[PDB]
Amino acid sequence: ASLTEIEHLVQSVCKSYRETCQLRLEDLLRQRSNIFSREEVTGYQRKSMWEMWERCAHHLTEAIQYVVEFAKRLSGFMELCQNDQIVLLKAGAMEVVLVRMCRAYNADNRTVFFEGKYGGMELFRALGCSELISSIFDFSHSLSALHFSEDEIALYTALVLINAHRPGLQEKRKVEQLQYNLELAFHHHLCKTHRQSILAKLPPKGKLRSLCSQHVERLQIFQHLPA
Ligand SMILES: C[C@@H](NC(=O)c1cc(-c2sc(C(=O)N[C@H]3C[C@H](C(=O)O)C3)nc2CC2CCCCC2)cc(C2(C)CC2)c1)C(F)(F)F
């Protein structure tokens, strides 16, 4: 690879994400002024667990379609065989949607954006799974502390999808090579922006799989939808 070409690689990842980011950043930041009234929360709490479950299931799949919408935008994704394309998304999709959640988390009052307005965690009392609902807010809270620049989330997300150290990829060396160019464009931009300091600050391995695996595991037990 070439240096001038790697900088090109960064511009694609940053753009492919900004066009497949679901919600605009300028929207979440400015519309953060209003939140659910205590009335509106009890209405969400009164909802049957199936009610709230049907909600997240849609918003989750919808947020994932943008995740896969992101993958097909990367400049080197299409070349590799379909199987590797399927595997990377299966294990990376749910984790990519987690990193994108902190981007909608307001660390000031612990309120995430869910259906046209910010709200706390008591909004999901109908579900009745505290430790799982809180594992996301606390995680996004830490990630929201670093004050992720949009370009970083795009770069970080790319390395979440790409991962040759995945279950059953076929032509892995095509995944290893690309997984490295992204890390190159990642570190280069970090140093190029004086934010190489975060590398020792991010979640290891690790928290992405363990946190999602707990959710993905509860659905493989109780559900029948996509699984
Ligand atoms: C099974 C288990 N977990 C999930 O169902 C689940 C839901 C979501 C998503 S994605 C999403 C969106 O895209 N919201 C956008 C679209 C909305 C809009 O258009 O306004 C805002 N909303 C949600 C629902 C929110 C529920 C409260 C905790 C934050 C997540 C994300 C995930 C990941 C990424 C962890 C794996 C898991 C469960 F907790 F459900 F039991």
Side-chain angles (χ1 to χ4, degrees):
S2 177
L3 172 66
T4 177
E5 308 178 17
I6 297 300
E7 186 65 10
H8 279 301
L9 203 175
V10 179
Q11 314 198 6
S12 178
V13 179
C14 298
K15 180 179 181 59
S16 297
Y17 168 85
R18 207 170 86 97
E19 291 176 324
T20 67
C21 61
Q22 187 169 14
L23 303 181
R24 309 179 181 96
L25 176 58
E26 283 65 32
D27 302 331
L28 296 113
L29 293 177
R30 312 303 153 86
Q31 185 174 336
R32 192 160 56 190
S33 56
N34 64 332
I35 54 80
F36 295 140
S37 308
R38 181 55 188 180
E39 310 168 274
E40 315 184 35
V41 166
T42 63
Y44 274 82
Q45 301 172 295
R46 185 188 327 281
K47 312 278 187 175
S48 175
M49 62 184 60
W50 299 90
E51 159 69 355
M52 293 302 305
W53 162 230
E54 218 86 51
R55 303 255 197 176
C56 310
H58 169 53
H59 290 321
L60 184 279
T61 58
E62 190 180 75
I64 294 188
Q65 289 193 356
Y66 278 130
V67 177
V68 56
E69 276 282 296
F70 182 25
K72 307 179 184 301
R73 312 292 288 270
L74 279 58
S75 304
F77 186 21
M78 324 321 305
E79 299 187 11
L80 61 91
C81 67
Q82 290 197 350
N83 189 339
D84 300 332
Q85 304 179 15
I86 311 296
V87 179
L88 301 178
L89 280 171
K90 283 212 169 187
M94 199 175 187
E95 309 174 316
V96 166
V97 187
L98 170 56
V99 175
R100 293 186 168 189
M101 282 300 302
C102 71
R103 182 172 175 265
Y105 173 80
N106 175 85
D108 263 325
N109 50 19
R110 297 172 170 263
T111 68
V112 68
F113 193 74
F114 175 78
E115 296 179 346
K117 202 178 304 178
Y118 283 93
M121 71 178 306
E122 57 272 356
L123 191 70
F124 307 93
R125 204 235 298 115
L127 291 142
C129 52
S130 304
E131 179 166 327
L132 298 79
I133 308 174
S134 58
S135 301
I136 318 302
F137 297 161
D138 300 335
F139 180 86
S140 299
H141 188 13
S142 59
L143 246 58
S144 184
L146 296 179
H147 304 103
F148 272 145
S149 59
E150 296 300 303
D151 306 330
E152 293 176 350
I153 303 179
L155 296 161
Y156 193 6
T157 298
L159 277 56
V160 180
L161 284 178
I162 315 302
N163 190 185
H165 316 296
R166 200 58 74 178
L169 317 79
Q170 296 182 281
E171 51 201 39
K172 289 187 54 183
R173 294 310 185 184
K174 300 182 61 179
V175 177
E176 288 241 21
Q177 176 64 345
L178 197 287
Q179 178 193 7
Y180 176 54
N181 284 12
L182 296 181
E183 296 181 353
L184 297 176
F186 189 15
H187 288 72
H188 174 282
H189 192 60
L190 299 164
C191 309
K192 198 69 176 183
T193 61
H194 298 136
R195 296 210 59 172
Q196 67 285 336
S197 318
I198 62 179
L199 273 43
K201 323 278 187 56
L202 302 106
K205 224 173 70 64
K207 299 291 184 176
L208 300 177
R209 190 209 75 92
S210 177
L211 238 53
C212 295
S213 299
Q214 297 183 0
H215 286 5
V216 107
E217 182 172 340
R218 184 179 183 93
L219 287 299
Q220 288 188 332
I221 306 174
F222 298 164
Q223 278 315 279
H224 47 92
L225 283 67

